[PDB]
Write a protein that binds this DNA or RNA. Structure first.
Lengths: 93, 46, 102, 63, 77, 13
RNA sequence: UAAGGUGAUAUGAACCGUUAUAACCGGCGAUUUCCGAAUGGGGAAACCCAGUGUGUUUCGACACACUAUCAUUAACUGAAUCCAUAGGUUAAUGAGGCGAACCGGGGGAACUGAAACAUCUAAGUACCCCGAGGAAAAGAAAUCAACCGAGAUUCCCCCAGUAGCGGCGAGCGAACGGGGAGCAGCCCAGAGCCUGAAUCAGUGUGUGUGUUAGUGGAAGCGUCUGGAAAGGCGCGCGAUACAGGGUGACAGCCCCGUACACAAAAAUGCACAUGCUGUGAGCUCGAUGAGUAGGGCGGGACACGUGGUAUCCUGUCUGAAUAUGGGGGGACCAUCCUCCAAGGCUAAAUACUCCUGACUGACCGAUAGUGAACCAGUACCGUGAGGGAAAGGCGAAAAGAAC
RNA sequence: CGAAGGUGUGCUGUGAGGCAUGCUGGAGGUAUCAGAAGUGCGAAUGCUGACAUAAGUAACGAUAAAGCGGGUGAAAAGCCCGCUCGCCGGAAGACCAAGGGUUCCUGUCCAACGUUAAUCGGGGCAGGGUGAGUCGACCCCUAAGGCGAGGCCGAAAGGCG
């Protein structure tokens, strides 16, 4: 059983932006970064345990890294997955 | 004026894809030659 | 097996100011050392709007080749070489020409 | 911080790994992302500690 | 393939020469045939693709001896 | 560099 | 080993360590995602979808392991017919793929030359395919020689552009014999006496040596020129160390090195001694490889193109003697000489370098040298196989120009 | 207290050349006598790079068409706003599939790119943006066709099934 440690690694970081702020104040939902796989069930369990909050539903999407032109060279950013988590009437963070 | 190249990902992969080369020994030699030359792209990868 | 260390008082054999004494502060992996008041460079430091605003011209210390500095004996009044010998199971440095331990 | 935990039993080794993963690994990561972490050297130090514990578990369990 | 299962005869390439000594590549084929041999040891028929020379070899020796050599060769018959 | 996910996204006509 | 460090472009931020678990180097271990022989099935490579068996927070759902094909072996099942066999399931062992050349084998050109061209040449070359090794192949006479004699195979220099072959054209081209490198001989087709009896292969121990980290390593100062001296001038010292590289212009004596003397907890190759396992010494007698040798027909290989053509191999059809026997000695016969085919094993001298270390060069010095001195087989071009560039230099030190 | 190279000058030999030196250059060069050559270029519709010529010439890519006021700006015929004019309207509108792969939106900049200017842009830099039990893929089924355990055939590779 590695479910506990798995839940401690799916979550990577919160997402800060205008869309994130308006979603939180209006829809009571938090947007955060997750691992590349990060199935919806794992994200739901991780938020319930680590943040000790009740959740309703999770929506995930994959963001493709942009292609950047650094110096004389061309590079690409890494793809990452962000999840929208909808909390219930009781919210903490 | 219709030109010779009409792109299609499915046709490109099924014709010159990695698995297409490995099916026959001639394709395997094509991969072997390009590994020896050190080419970054072994085949047309989606 | 470095002959010049962190805390050593050395003298300059060749350079802009040969014969000037000093003490080394750091040594670079490229065989270079930094000493006080020996190789001063008037670097033109640009202003930056960050937390630090040095501005003006800064008198920095420029690294010098370790081969151009020799540890000073401090007893014979001249530069001297360095050798390594094993005493009580420990490798220690010593001078030459009536060699004594550091 | 290598032979201190060599002689502990497997039960404590799993316990210390869990709190290493739980605290100072997840919490530090959230702090760094939010910009509230100024001592970023803890992240690497904690990661190496987790590796050390896992190395012990393998040479303890089974083989 | 056109390989005798007893003597191992296989097609061999060669030349055919005309009156003007013109040389063209040809191929000599063994006189292979499919034959059923009755074996009393196992009490059944075994089909072998054998050449005419091989059939003479089987007659001179025993069918059992030839089968043993084939089994030692490592190829199923 | 190479993207490998040309999945189909057909919006209902 | 250590007073420094956290790889580079590439500074910074935050920290570790300084007498020992900072960092770095070496041995032995652990982790080792996904694709790829890919091997649970599939597939547009890095993706999708499973079955069975082991253990667990809300049934929820999780974690691990196994599950490809083929060949051999063993067990259990098992038809058309009794038996049986085929077939099926299970377990174990081995293989699979990749890699620059060298080696053996199976296939096999044309251009070109002949001043045309068909025999011939190019050439058993290029290329395709199969198999194995560190080398491979070959190898202990049914061989030569000449009636004097040598005794496995392989490689180099002669013999020798010789004898021969050849639209006797173009061309191809030996052998005998001699001088060298290196040398090693055996086993089965079988019984008896004697039975570890030598030599071998696999696993322990011990000595020596080598590889994988390393340690010490001699001896110079003063004036002149100068941005700076290692240069000039004057006087010294080391050398079993003036081989090289660096250092503000050219250093034996400033630094790293160099000759020299040492170093190994652990893993390893080589040469020996000592144990175990397995086949196996020595003597007597006998045996001594049959669809084979040879022959007819059609081809190929031997320098030798069917010619007077020996010898070898083979597709096809035939077919002995067996030691009072048989083979060869260049058509063939007789006499002599020599050897014993139709079953196998065998290191040395020989061929090559994808890769590792050191060293060398009347080799190149950025249109040269590898296509590539600069993150080049990259950019770019092509559906694809494939083709394929240009681009080095501030200064001793960024001191990279505050204002 | 100045090598090679570069650039002038003055002497010198029947010649290819040599010698001395002014300025730039900045650290290498090499007598004599022998030795070996990737040993000498004006041509090959030679190869590579650079730079001329035509020449400040042709052209600036559908003859659907622009005018004015204000704003921003160093600068406005082209950008923004406003009022008119004109063009498409089975399209020059709105949607997709295929194919592209961030060209989407905001802030900021005008070197190069835009066949002109440019404050503007599909340009540069930074940040943001793609939310599914019902859409689609995936998945269940199959057509043409592909592969193909055994199997048949084939010098090998391999062909067919």
């Amino acid at each position: 059983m590695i479910r506990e440690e798995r839940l401690l690694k799916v979550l990577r970081a919160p997402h800060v932006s205008e869309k994130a702020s308006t979603a939180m104040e209006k829809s009571n939902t938090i947007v955060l970064k997750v691992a590349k796989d990060a199935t919806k069930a794992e994200i739901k369990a991780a938020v319930q345990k680590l943040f000790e909050v009740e959740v309703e539903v999770v929506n995930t999407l994959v963001v493709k890294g942009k292609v950047k032109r650094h110096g004389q060279r061309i590079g690409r950013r890494s793809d990452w997955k962000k999840a929208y988590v909808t909390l219930k009437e009781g919210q903490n963070l | 004026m219709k030109r010779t190249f009409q792109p299609s990902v499915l046709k490109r992969n099924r014709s010159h894809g990695f698995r297409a080369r490995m099916a026959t020994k001639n394709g395997r030699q094509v991969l072997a030659r390009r590994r020896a030359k050190g080419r970054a792209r072994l085949t047309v990868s989606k | 097996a470095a002959k010049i260390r962190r805390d050593d008082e050395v003298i300059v054999l060749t350079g802009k100011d040969k014969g000037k004494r000093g003490k080394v502060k750091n040594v670079l992996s490229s065989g270079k050392v930094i000493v006080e008041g020996i190789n001063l460079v008037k670097k033109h430091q640009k202003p930056v709007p960050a937390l630090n605003q040095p501005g003006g011209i800064v008198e920095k210390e420029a690294a010098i080749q370790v081969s151009n500095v020799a540890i000073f004996n401090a007893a014979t009044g001249k530069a001297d070489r360095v050798g390594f010998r094993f005493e009580d199971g420990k490798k220690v440095r010593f001078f030459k020409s009536n060699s004594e331990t550091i | 911080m290598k032979a201190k935990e060599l002689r502990e039993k497997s039960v404590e080794e799993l316990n210390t790994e869990l709190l290493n993963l739980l605290r100072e690994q997840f919490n530090l990561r959230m702090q760094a992302a939010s910009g509230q972490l100024q001592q970023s050297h803890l992240l690497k130090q904690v990661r190496r500690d987790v590796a050390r514990v896992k190395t012990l578990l393998n040479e303890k369990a089974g083989a | 393939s056109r390989v005798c299962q007893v003597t191992g005869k296989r097609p061999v390439t060669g030349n055919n020469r005309s009156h003007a000594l013109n040389a063209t590549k040809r191929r000599f084929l063994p006189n292979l045939h499919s034959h059923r041999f009755w074996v009393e040891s196992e009490k059944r028929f075994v089909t072998l693709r054998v050449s005419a020379k091989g059939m003479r070899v089987i007659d001179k020796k025993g069918i059992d001896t030839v089968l043993a050599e084939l089994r030692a060769r490592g190829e199923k018959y | 560099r190479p993207v490998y996910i040309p999945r189909p996204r057909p919006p209902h006509p």
